[PDB]
Amino acid sequence: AFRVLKPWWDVFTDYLSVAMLMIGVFGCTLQVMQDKIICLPKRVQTVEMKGLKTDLDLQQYSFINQMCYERALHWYAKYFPYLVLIHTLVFMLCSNFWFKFPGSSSKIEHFISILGKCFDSPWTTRALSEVSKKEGEQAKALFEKVKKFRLHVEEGDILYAMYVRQTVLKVIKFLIIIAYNSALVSKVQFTVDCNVDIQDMTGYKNFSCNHTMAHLFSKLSFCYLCFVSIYGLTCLYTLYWLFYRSLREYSFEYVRQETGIDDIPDVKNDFAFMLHMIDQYDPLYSKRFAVFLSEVSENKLKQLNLNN
Amino acid sequence: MICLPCKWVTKDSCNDSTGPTGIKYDLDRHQYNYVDAVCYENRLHWFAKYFPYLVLLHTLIFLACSNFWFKFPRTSSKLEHFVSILLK
Amino acid sequence: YMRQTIIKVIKFALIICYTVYYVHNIKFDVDCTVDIESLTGYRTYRCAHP
Amino acid sequence: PAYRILKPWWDVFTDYISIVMLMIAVFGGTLQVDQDKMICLPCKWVTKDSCNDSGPTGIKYDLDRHQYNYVDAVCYENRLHWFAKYFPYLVLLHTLIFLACSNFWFKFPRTSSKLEHFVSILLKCFDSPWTTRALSEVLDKKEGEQAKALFEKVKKFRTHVEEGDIVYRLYMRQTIIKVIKFALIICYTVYYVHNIKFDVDCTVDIESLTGYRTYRCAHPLATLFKILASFYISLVIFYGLICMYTLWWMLRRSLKKYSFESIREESSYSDIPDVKNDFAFMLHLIDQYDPLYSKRFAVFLSEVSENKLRQLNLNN
Amino acid sequence: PAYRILKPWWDVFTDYISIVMLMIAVFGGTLQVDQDKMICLPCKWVTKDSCNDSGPTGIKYDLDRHQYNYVDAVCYENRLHWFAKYFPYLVLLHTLIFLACSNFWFKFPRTSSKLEHFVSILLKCFDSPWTTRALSELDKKEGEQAKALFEKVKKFRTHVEEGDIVYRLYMRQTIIKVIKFALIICYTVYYVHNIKFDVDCTVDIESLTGYRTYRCAHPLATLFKILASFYISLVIFYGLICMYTLWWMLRRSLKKYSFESIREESSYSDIPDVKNDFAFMLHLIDQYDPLYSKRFAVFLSEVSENKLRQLNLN
Amino acid sequence: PAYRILKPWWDVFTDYISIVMLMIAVFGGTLQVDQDKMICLPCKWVTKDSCNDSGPTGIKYDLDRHQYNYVDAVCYENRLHWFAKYFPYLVLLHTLIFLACSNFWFKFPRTSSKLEHFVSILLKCFDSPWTTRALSEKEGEQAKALFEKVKKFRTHVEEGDIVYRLYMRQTIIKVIKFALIICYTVYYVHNIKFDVDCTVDIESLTGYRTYRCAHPLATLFKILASFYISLVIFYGLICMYTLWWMLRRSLKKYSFESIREESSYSDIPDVKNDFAFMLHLIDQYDPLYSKRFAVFLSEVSENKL
């Protein structure tokens, strides 16, 4: 399971995307059956009031309705749910870009495996208590696994970079969505004026229409806009965390303060980035792995193993 | 929202003033539908229009609040580990 | 857990305030004066919300 | 499922695309079944059976609602183009044929038995402890006997599948059929996608029943049937592109011979002979999903590893 | 499922064809429930109780909406061919009959028990380590399981060879499917042409409506014709597959199974000649995969028993 | 589930008829909900409180659409036969009672527990391999424990015959319900007619006394009714046969004469009550299981053990 490598912002955006998809599905269902426009001709033909007679059949009324729905209504009011569905599917597909890559997922599985193994390894806690047999053999095997992982992962540079690409893509898509939604959210209005030229068919050329689902689509548009705004603040803070502190280098000086050992080489590049990930998840794993990263700790372990 | 016009009005208010005969309004079906839509949008209270959506939103907030610590990973890790060690 | 309980109780307070304040506005008969005389011919309509 | 190891990235991408076109099919079918009508109004003034198109008062056509429904039905069935009426059903049929072509490898029993046996032995080798021990290069006696047994299964399965090439031929056949079908869909759809129009003039000659000769209809779900079709086309293109890549992957390398040169060089056992035909193609697909499965299964195919296990079991 | 090994390519192809036929049957049924009607307009001008059909102004038929609904219902009941009305129920019933005929193999308790117990023996023989050792040519527990499975194999051979109920059941199911295909094809091909868009109904409701003859447009007529053509094509495929299955049963005696090829290729040359119902099941498992039969047949040789008893003692 | 062994051909095949009766009940109920109406047109020429039935132009009735709807509702309620209106609900009710009567055998906790224990130990005795050596005429401890379990179950089950009497009662209920269903359905199937003549006396509200209505879902209902009858007929035949079978011989007295004559162990006594009936059902499903289980019921097989 890679949910351990998933931070809180990723799962927050996941539930936000699920809510966005639900909003899009609801809007599409509204558009399928409840979406209709009602058009009445303009300039027809204690007091008493008499109704204005338009002299129009039901079929002329339906023709006016759909002729003004196709033309007079703004395209945003007609295709807002479909745009929401498309954008939320792109968001969901992009949300696990950094998760779905084959080599990246292999590196993530290897990293979570070694970190869980050293967390389950008694020698981590034993050495942490000491500074501040069979299990020694397993500790030495885990330490050479640590060295193998250092030689296999640390030299690469794909993880932080491609995470930055994913965050930048999310921020850009958020900005585009917010810009176009704020530009076209005033188009969704209840009463519209339709000026199609069907005078040869219905006798009238100017109609006043109302879009019956304009209020609900406006509320749905504002709800989706606020959801996208929250998504964008999440991605902006993610960008701030990515760029403010260099995740190309992880300083183990806090372990140097806690653990008496000082010959701890600072990890670099993807090792630093993934240790930043797990520190956001649980810093105890990082400070417990740092004593398994020092080669002086390896020399001491070799000395104790030779003594045993 | 089935809307019927007031034939006799007195300053924006219905006056409410041998067999009985039905009142002829001379309104088409589509004029009636237009009146329904306009009065439904304008005069019927927002609570009667958005009550189920408000209820759904409140339930979603309540369910998110109840299940937040199960999905928040910093507490989810502790809860899962505690569950595993307690059953075991 | 404390924060979740606090948020739930204040949410309950807000809901049980505004819902009970606006629950009497769900009426059957509603009079509408929407001023569409130029299209329909009347001004005031007595609607019934089913 | 348990067959995901034989499904490469292009296969799962085609599966996702076909799922989306199934969604298109169900959406268009629901729309066509429920709300697909055709409101037609008579042209009151006609010049040579063509609409003249010459406060204002409404035009009285003197037609009942049932006459209007009759006009709508006749001008929907006689003058609206067949593509606009049957686009979602064609989409569903093509999606079903694409899924059938994808799973004809999956359901046809003659190749299905080989796939089950290959997946079962691969999963056994993945979970075999002596496989991990040999990859690392003292055992349980029963575990050693089972390891020698799985060696024998590897040899007999080699003799079983190397004699035939129906699996590779089947996969190539479905790839070719998918490419040809995608070409046909793209051609006929780009031909007929412009026939979906909003305003359609109809001339049905029902003047004896309604009193009018020519009418003008406005098909409601036209533009929404337009863009969907266009977007449908887009998905098909991607499908075809993916399929074409698979066709390229059919001819870039000979899948009937898959060499072990990289595996034996990195491993200690530099003795393994190459595989052929269905075994070679299936190992190619395994490499497409993950080379680790093939490299791990390589230690159960060599004779030096057989001798090493025999000596170990003598010690064990 | 467990009976997947007993389903050859013809059976699974007929299963998918039946699933598709059921899908189009449900589609047509929902269509006929919801959107099926006929829009009927009276013929204003008549010639001997027919339709004379002699700016333009619309014809005033002076009929209410309910008179039109009555005309539609009466003409739909009286003058519209029964095929165009009950085609979805016909394809649904035929598909259900085909599916029941195909799945009656696994539901009749005698044959169901025979196939299930056969499947269990075949599976545990495929997973039997002594099968592996016999193919190559011993723990005491594995030897005990091997002896138990050998006894189960021979007692099954005694139990199933006495009567061929499974072979007769499968032959009768195939015969019924072929006959049903033939009947469906003749009557459907004969009756497709009666699904027309325009139908003239002379239903004599002049006392209630005022008109005698009416012209009706059937909206779900071209759709029903297309579905009928699709159903005809599917039944063509089903019938060709069933005819191949019948030819497969009839060309060679499936009640006899010569083990000469396997006993010649494999080391054991004493393999008995399986006959009657067991021969039919072994032909089915051959049609699935010859490897299953090859890895099960090592338990039928009496020579392997002698090797198994000797290795059990050793 | 685990009760497939206790389901002979009559049980499974009538269950299939029971599941296909339910489909036409749901299909009919959907039809009754959606478009079960009556299009009623007034008879302008009326003679002796009936329709006189005495270019062309349409007949003006001067009736509103709502007057037509009121006429439809009143004549559908008063002058449509109740069989036509409530056929799908009656079919659903009969099918639900059939399902309840065929599954209360497995849902009643007494018989449920007894059948579950019989099935469990029959399966675990079928998994036992020592029956092979028995019928040929740590593993030993397992066979002895299963022998003890079989004997102690027999001493518990052979005392009473609750399962047999409950199965008899269920089958008798099924056959009498089939008889009632086929009788009343044959009686009332002809009342489903397309055209009907309603006379409701609403002249005050409409202006006409007699109307001639058309019921759209009549012929469909008619053929559905015929289909239902066919299914019921088939069902009854199977139930009839079940009666004959359960009255052919003493189902409460299972004799192991053939098995103990074929095998060496001739000490097998005659089984009585629920164990006897359940072994009879086993023989019906598969004679192999009863023969294979019979050796552990014999004490000289324990003498071999």
XYZ file of N, CA, C and O in Angstrom, chain E residues 131-262:
528
model
N 0.882 -37.647 -9.778
C 0.772 -37.406 -11.214
C 2.095 -36.893 -11.767
O 2.568 -37.344 -12.818
N 2.716 -35.961 -11.043
C 4.002 -35.411 -11.452
C 5.078 -36.488 -11.483
O 5.867 -36.568 -12.434
N 5.126 -37.328 -10.447
C 6.147 -38.372 -10.398
C 5.920 -39.422 -11.482
O 6.881 -39.938 -12.065
N 4.657 -39.747 -11.770
C 4.351 -40.700 -12.831
C 4.703 -40.138 -14.202
O 5.165 -40.875 -15.081
N 4.475 -38.839 -14.410
C 4.894 -38.207 -15.657
C 6.412 -38.201 -15.784
O 6.951 -38.405 -16.879
N 7.117 -37.958 -14.675
C 8.575 -38.010 -14.698
C 9.076 -39.427 -14.956
O 10.031 -39.627 -15.715
N 8.445 -40.420 -14.336
C 8.835 -41.814 -14.529
C 8.067 -42.442 -15.686
O 7.640 -41.750 -16.609
N 9.368 -40.380 -2.231
C 7.931 -40.240 -2.032
C 7.600 -40.131 -0.548
O 7.915 -41.027 0.236
N 6.968 -39.024 -0.166
C 6.546 -38.848 1.216
C 5.371 -39.767 1.527
O 4.589 -40.124 0.642
N 5.256 -40.159 2.798
C 4.193 -41.079 3.191
C 2.821 -40.421 3.097
O 1.842 -41.070 2.713
N 2.730 -39.136 3.448
C 1.459 -38.425 3.343
C 1.029 -38.288 1.887
O -0.136 -38.532 1.540
N 1.965 -37.899 1.019
C 1.662 -37.788 -0.404
C 1.338 -39.153 -0.998
O 0.474 -39.265 -1.874
N 2.002 -40.206 -0.518
C 1.662 -41.549 -0.962
C 0.265 -41.971 -0.541
O -0.448 -42.634 -1.299
N -0.138 -41.603 0.679
C -1.496 -41.893 1.133
C -2.527 -41.161 0.285
O -3.544 -41.746 -0.116
N -2.279 -39.880 -0.003
C -3.180 -39.128 -0.874
C -3.220 -39.731 -2.274
O -4.277 -39.779 -2.911
N -2.072 -40.203 -2.764
C -2.011 -40.828 -4.081
C -2.823 -42.115 -4.129
O -3.549 -42.358 -5.098
N -2.701 -42.956 -3.099
C -3.476 -44.194 -3.055
C -4.968 -43.899 -2.962
O -5.788 -44.548 -3.627
N -5.336 -42.907 -2.143
C -6.738 -42.519 -2.031
C -7.279 -42.015 -3.363
O -8.393 -42.372 -3.762
N -6.496 -41.205 -4.077
C -6.955 -40.678 -5.357
C -7.009 -41.769 -6.420
O -7.877 -41.738 -7.297
N -6.095 -42.741 -6.361
C -6.152 -43.878 -7.275
C -7.428 -44.682 -7.060
O -8.109 -45.071 -8.023
N -7.764 -44.941 -5.793
C -8.995 -45.664 -5.493
C -10.218 -44.864 -5.920
O -11.183 -45.433 -6.448
N -10.187 -43.544 -5.718
C -11.281 -42.696 -6.177
C -11.419 -42.749 -7.693
O -12.536 -42.790 -8.218
N -10.293 -42.775 -8.410
C -10.326 -42.830 -9.870
C -10.959 -44.134 -10.345
O -11.841 -44.133 -11.212
N -10.528 -45.268 -9.779
C -11.075 -46.539 -10.256
C -12.540 -46.703 -9.857
O -13.343 -47.248 -10.627
N -12.917 -46.224 -8.669
C -14.310 -46.347 -8.253
C -15.202 -45.410 -9.065
O -16.352 -45.742 -9.367
N -14.667 -44.255 -9.477
C -15.375 -43.397 -10.421
C -15.539 -44.072 -11.775
O -16.601 -43.972 -12.401
N -14.491 -44.752 -12.246
C -14.571 -45.474 -13.513
C -15.654 -46.541 -13.460
O -16.403 -46.734 -14.423
N -15.750 -47.247 -12.333
C -16.837 -48.207 -12.165
C -18.191 -47.507 -12.085
O -19.190 -48.015 -12.607
N -18.241 -46.338 -11.443
C -19.523 -45.722 -11.116
C -20.162 -45.041 -12.324
O -21.393 -44.991 -12.430
N -19.360 -44.512 -13.242
C -19.886 -43.704 -14.347
C -19.998 -44.501 -15.643
O -20.754 -44.128 -16.540
N -19.258 -45.604 -15.768
C -19.268 -46.339 -17.030
C -20.535 -47.173 -17.183
O -20.872 -47.591 -18.298
N -21.259 -47.410 -16.087
C -22.440 -48.267 -16.141
C -23.557 -47.641 -16.971
O -24.286 -48.345 -17.680
N -23.707 -46.326 -16.899
C -24.771 -45.650 -17.619
C -24.292 -44.345 -18.217
O -23.543 -43.587 -17.597
N -24.737 -44.092 -19.447
C -24.420 -42.849 -20.149
C -25.607 -41.890 -20.066
O -26.381 -41.714 -21.007
N -25.740 -41.264 -18.898
C -26.791 -40.269 -18.714
C -26.314 -38.893 -19.163
O -27.080 -38.116 -19.745
N -25.038 -38.580 -18.927
C -24.501 -37.275 -19.298
C -24.429 -37.127 -20.813
O -24.762 -36.068 -21.361
N -23.991 -38.177 -21.511
C -23.911 -38.124 -22.967
C -25.291 -37.948 -23.584
O -25.476 -37.135 -24.498
N -26.277 -38.701 -23.089
C -27.634 -38.576 -23.608
C -28.211 -37.199 -23.311
O -28.896 -36.614 -24.156
N -27.939 -36.664 -22.118
C -28.430 -35.334 -21.774
C -27.837 -34.273 -22.691
O -28.556 -33.400 -23.192
N -26.525 -34.336 -22.933
C -25.888 -33.344 -23.794
C -26.372 -33.470 -25.235
O -26.598 -32.457 -25.911
N -26.543 -34.703 -25.718
C -27.042 -34.907 -27.074
C -28.459 -34.369 -27.225
O -28.785 -33.716 -28.224
N -29.317 -34.623 -26.234
C -30.682 -34.114 -26.295
C -30.713 -32.594 -26.210
O -31.517 -31.951 -26.894
N -29.849 -32.001 -25.383
C -29.785 -30.545 -25.307
C -29.360 -29.942 -26.639
O -29.941 -28.949 -27.093
N -28.355 -30.535 -27.287
C -27.919 -30.034 -28.586
C -29.011 -30.195 -29.639
O -29.223 -29.294 -30.462
N -29.721 -31.326 -29.624
C -30.799 -31.551 -30.587
C -31.914 -30.529 -30.387
O -32.444 -29.960 -31.352
N -32.275 -30.271 -29.127
C -33.313 -29.289 -28.824
C -32.879 -27.899 -29.272
O -33.673 -27.135 -29.831
N -31.609 -27.553 -29.044
C -31.117 -26.241 -29.455
C -31.142 -26.088 -30.972
O -31.510 -25.028 -31.491
N -30.772 -27.143 -31.702
C -30.795 -27.086 -33.165
C -32.225 -26.935 -33.675
O -32.503 -26.131 -34.576
N -33.156 -27.705 -33.103
C -34.553 -27.624 -33.528
C -35.130 -26.246 -33.223
O -35.845 -25.657 -34.046
N -34.822 -25.709 -32.040
C -35.292 -24.378 -31.671
C -34.724 -23.323 -32.609
O -35.435 -22.401 -33.019
N -33.443 -23.449 -32.967
C -32.840 -22.531 -33.929
C -33.559 -22.586 -35.268
O -33.850 -21.543 -35.866
N -33.851 -23.793 -35.753
C -34.524 -23.928 -37.042
C -35.903 -23.281 -37.012
O -36.258 -22.510 -37.915
N -36.685 -23.566 -35.963
C -38.031 -23.008 -35.857
C -37.999 -21.488 -35.739
O -38.779 -20.784 -36.403
N -37.091 -20.968 -34.904
C -36.941 -19.528 -34.744
C -36.605 -18.884 -36.078
O -37.190 -17.864 -36.456
N -35.684 -19.491 -36.828
C -35.272 -18.891 -38.089
C -36.419 -18.865 -39.085
O -36.680 -17.822 -39.696
N -37.148 -19.976 -39.252
C -38.196 -19.955 -40.273
C -39.289 -18.959 -39.905
O -39.683 -18.128 -40.734
N -39.758 -18.985 -38.651
C -40.888 -18.115 -38.336
C -40.470 -16.646 -38.280
O -41.211 -15.771 -38.740
N -39.268 -16.353 -37.775
C -38.819 -14.967 -37.720
C -38.536 -14.418 -39.114
O -38.895 -13.277 -39.416
N -37.895 -15.209 -39.980
C -37.638 -14.751 -41.341
C -38.949 -14.543 -42.086
O -39.098 -13.582 -42.852
N -39.935 -15.412 -41.847
C -41.242 -15.229 -42.465
C -41.931 -13.965 -41.957
O -42.581 -13.265 -42.740
N -41.793 -13.642 -40.670
C -42.621 -12.610 -40.061
C -41.912 -11.277 -39.836
O -42.520 -10.366 -39.266
N -40.649 -11.132 -40.247
C -39.986 -9.830 -40.133
C -40.638 -8.762 -41.005
O -40.816 -7.626 -40.546
N -41.053 -9.101 -42.225
C -41.549 -8.114 -43.177
C -42.855 -7.459 -42.746
O -43.264 -6.473 -43.367
N -43.518 -7.975 -41.715
C -44.742 -7.382 -41.199
C -44.487 -6.233 -40.231
O -45.449 -5.626 -39.750
N -43.228 -5.924 -39.928
C -42.887 -4.759 -39.109
C -42.705 -3.594 -40.076
O -41.629 -3.377 -40.630
N -43.775 -2.833 -40.281
C -43.760 -1.685 -41.173
C -43.985 -0.401 -40.388
O -44.548 -0.413 -39.291
N -43.530 0.711 -40.965
C -43.740 2.015 -40.345
C -45.186 2.467 -40.496
O -45.839 2.843 -39.517
N -45.707 2.429 -41.718
C -47.048 2.921 -42.013
C -48.000 1.736 -42.125
O -47.739 0.791 -42.875
N -49.102 1.788 -41.383
C -50.101 0.721 -41.376
C -51.482 1.357 -41.456
O -51.771 2.322 -40.742
N -52.342 0.820 -42.313
C -53.702 1.328 -42.423
C -54.652 0.450 -41.619
O -54.698 -0.768 -41.815
N -55.412 1.068 -40.716
C -56.330 0.341 -39.847
C -57.759 0.758 -40.162
O -58.085 1.946 -40.128
N -58.604 -0.217 -40.472
C -60.036 -0.002 -40.665
C -60.746 -0.775 -39.560
O -61.082 -1.950 -39.730
N -60.972 -0.114 -38.428
C -61.372 -0.783 -37.197
C -62.827 -0.517 -36.837
O -63.323 -1.075 -35.851
N -63.525 0.319 -37.608
C -64.968 0.536 -37.465
C -65.336 1.056 -36.075
O -66.034 0.398 -35.299
N -64.854 2.256 -35.760
C -65.246 2.943 -34.534
C -65.941 4.241 -34.914
O -65.811 5.254 -34.218
N -66.671 4.219 -36.033
C -67.337 5.421 -36.527
C -68.370 5.949 -35.541
O -68.664 7.149 -35.537
N -68.931 5.077 -34.703
C -69.900 5.523 -33.710
C -69.256 6.333 -32.594
O -69.931 7.169 -31.986
N -67.973 6.109 -32.314
C -67.277 6.806 -31.241
C -66.368 7.922 -31.723
O -66.193 8.908 -31.007
N -65.783 7.790 -32.910
C -64.858 8.779 -33.446
C -65.455 9.571 -34.602
O -65.338 10.799 -34.641
N -66.116 8.896 -35.535
C -66.675 9.520 -36.719
C -65.975 9.141 -38.004
O -66.508 9.408 -39.090
N -64.801 8.523 -37.921
C -64.062 8.059 -39.080
C -63.934 6.544 -39.023
O -63.900 5.944 -37.946
N -63.855 5.925 -40.198
C -63.757 4.475 -40.306
C -62.333 3.992 -40.521
O -61.880 3.075 -39.830
N -61.610 4.584 -41.466
C -60.259 4.159 -41.799
C -59.249 5.205 -41.348
O -59.486 6.410 -41.476
N -58.121 4.736 -40.821
C -57.073 5.589 -40.290
C -55.729 5.107 -40.815
O -55.557 3.934 -41.156
N -54.772 6.027 -40.876
C -53.405 5.726 -41.276
C -52.506 5.977 -40.077
O -52.521 7.073 -39.508
N -51.734 4.968 -39.687
C -50.924 5.006 -38.484
C -49.445 4.948 -38.832
O -49.012 4.207 -39.720
N -48.673 5.737 -38.090
C -47.218 5.689 -38.157
C -46.750 4.986 -36.886
O -47.084 5.417 -35.780
N -46.005 3.907 -37.059
C -45.446 3.145 -35.953
C -44.040 3.654 -35.663
O -43.131 3.392 -36.460
N -43.812 4.375 -34.562
C -42.487 4.991 -34.361
C -41.363 3.987 -34.170
O -40.272 4.166 -34.726
N -41.595 2.932 -33.391
C -40.577 1.916 -33.139
C -40.706 0.765 -34.137
O -40.808 -0.407 -33.780
N -40.703 1.125 -35.418
C -40.801 0.147 -36.493
C -39.454 -0.142 -37.137
O -39.087 -1.308 -37.302
N -38.706 0.898 -37.510
C -37.378 0.673 -38.070
C -36.415 0.172 -37.002
O -35.554 -0.669 -37.282
N -36.550 0.670 -35.770
C -35.734 0.157 -34.675
C -36.032 -1.312 -34.409
O -35.114 -2.111 -34.193
N -37.312 -1.690 -34.431
C -37.668 -3.089 -34.232
C -37.195 -3.952 -35.392
O -36.790 -5.098 -35.189
N -37.240 -3.423 -36.616
C -36.734 -4.172 -37.763
C -35.228 -4.385 -37.664
O -34.723 -5.469 -37.983
N -34.496 -3.361 -37.222
C -33.054 -3.489 -37.043
C -32.738 -4.495 -35.941
O -31.838 -5.332 -36.086
N -33.476 -4.438 -34.829
C -33.286 -5.420 -33.766
C -33.629 -6.828 -34.235
O -32.965 -7.788 -33.836
N -34.653 -6.970 -35.078
C -35.010 -8.280 -35.611
C -33.919 -8.818 -36.525
O -33.611 -10.012 -36.498
N -33.328 -7.953 -37.352
C -32.225 -8.390 -38.204
C -31.008 -8.787 -37.375
O -30.335 -9.782 -37.679
N -30.712 -8.023 -36.321
C -29.617 -8.381 -35.423
C -29.882 -9.715 -34.734
O -28.976 -10.549 -34.604
N -31.124 -9.935 -34.298
C -31.500 -11.202 -33.681
C -31.380 -12.353 -34.671
O -30.954 -13.452 -34.310
N -31.757 -12.115 -35.929
C -31.643 -13.149 -36.955
C -30.182 -13.513 -37.183
O -29.833 -14.691 -37.305
N -29.305 -12.509 -37.235
C -27.878 -12.782 -37.400
C -27.322 -13.564 -36.212
O -26.546 -14.518 -36.382
N -27.717 -13.179 -34.996
C -27.250 -13.887 -33.809
C -27.743 -15.329 -33.794
O -27.001 -16.242 -33.417
N -28.991 -15.554 -34.205
C -29.530 -16.909 -34.245
C -28.866 -17.718 -35.357
O -28.672 -18.929 -35.222
N -28.485 -17.065 -36.459
C -27.691 -17.735 -37.490
C -26.377 -18.240 -36.907
O -25.990 -19.397 -37.114
N -25.680 -17.380 -36.161
C -24.418 -17.796 -35.550
C -24.639 -18.926 -34.550
O -23.896 -19.919 -34.536
N -25.679 -18.800 -33.723
C -25.997 -19.814 -32.723
C -26.310 -21.153 -33.380
O -25.865 -22.208 -32.919
N -27.067 -21.119 -34.475
C -27.457 -22.350 -35.134
C -26.310 -23.009 -35.869
O -26.212 -24.234 -35.910
N -25.427 -22.206 -36.465
C -24.240 -22.785 -37.085
C -23.338 -23.433 -36.040
O -22.806 -24.530 -36.261
N -23.177 -22.783 -34.884
C -22.369 -23.362 -33.812
C -22.997 -24.657 -33.303
O -22.308 -25.664 -33.094
N -24.319 -24.656 -33.109
C -25.000 -25.858 -32.640
C -24.954 -26.976 -33.672
O -24.850 -28.151 -33.305
N -25.042 -26.636 -34.959
C -24.921 -27.644 -36.005
C -23.523 -28.244 -36.024
O -23.361 -29.453 -36.231
N -22.498 -27.417 -35.802
C -21.151 -27.961 -35.666
C -21.043 -28.884 -34.461
O -20.380 -29.922 -34.531
N -21.661 -28.510 -33.340
C -21.614 -29.364 -32.154
C -22.293 -30.703 -32.418
O -21.784 -31.762 -32.030
N -23.444 -30.670 -33.091
C -24.146 -31.902 -33.437
C -23.316 -32.765 -34.377
O -23.254 -33.992 -34.214
N -22.665 -32.143 -35.363
C -21.786 -32.886 -36.261
C -20.616 -33.492 -35.501
O -20.188 -34.614 -35.791
N -20.081 -32.753 -34.528
C -18.980 -33.259 -33.716
C -19.399 -34.488 -32.923
O -18.643 -35.460 -32.827
N -20.600 -34.459 -32.342
C -21.083 -35.639 -31.629
C -21.330 -36.807 -32.575
O -21.021 -37.956 -32.242
N -21.886 -36.540 -33.754
C -22.375 -37.612 -34.612
C -21.316 -38.224 -35.521
O -21.485 -39.369 -35.951
N -20.237 -37.501 -35.834
C -19.255 -38.023 -36.783
C -18.486 -39.202 -36.195
O -18.156 -40.159 -36.905
N -18.198 -39.153 -34.899
C -17.407 -40.171 -34.231
C -18.100 -40.589 -32.942
O -18.817 -39.806 -32.314
N -17.880 -41.840 -32.553
C -18.501 -42.385 -31.353
C -17.808 -41.799 -30.131
O -16.703 -42.219 -29.775
N -18.452 -40.826 -29.486
C -17.915 -40.267 -28.253
C -18.080 -41.203 -27.066
O -17.506 -40.938 -26.005
N -18.849 -42.277 -27.214
C -18.968 -43.288 -26.177
C -17.752 -44.202 -26.112
O -17.660 -45.024 -25.198
N -16.823 -44.080 -27.058
C -15.569 -44.826 -27.024
C -14.434 -43.813 -27.055
O -14.511 -42.812 -27.773
N -13.410 -44.037 -26.237
C -12.265 -43.136 -26.138
C -10.999 -43.980 -26.208
O -10.590 -44.581 -25.210
N -10.380 -44.027 -27.382
C -9.142 -44.772 -27.546
C -7.986 -43.996 -26.928
O -7.666 -42.886 -27.364
N -7.361 -44.584 -25.908
C -6.186 -44.012 -25.264
C -4.888 -44.430 -25.942
O -3.828 -44.401 -25.305
N -4.949 -44.827 -27.215
C -3.771 -45.355 -27.895
C -2.690 -44.291 -28.046
O -1.501 -44.566 -27.845
N -3.085 -43.066 -28.403
C -2.108 -42.005 -28.628
C -1.373 -41.645 -27.341
O -0.142 -41.526 -27.329
N -2.113 -41.475 -26.245
C -1.486 -41.089 -24.983
C -0.666 -42.241 -24.414
O 0.435 -42.035 -23.889
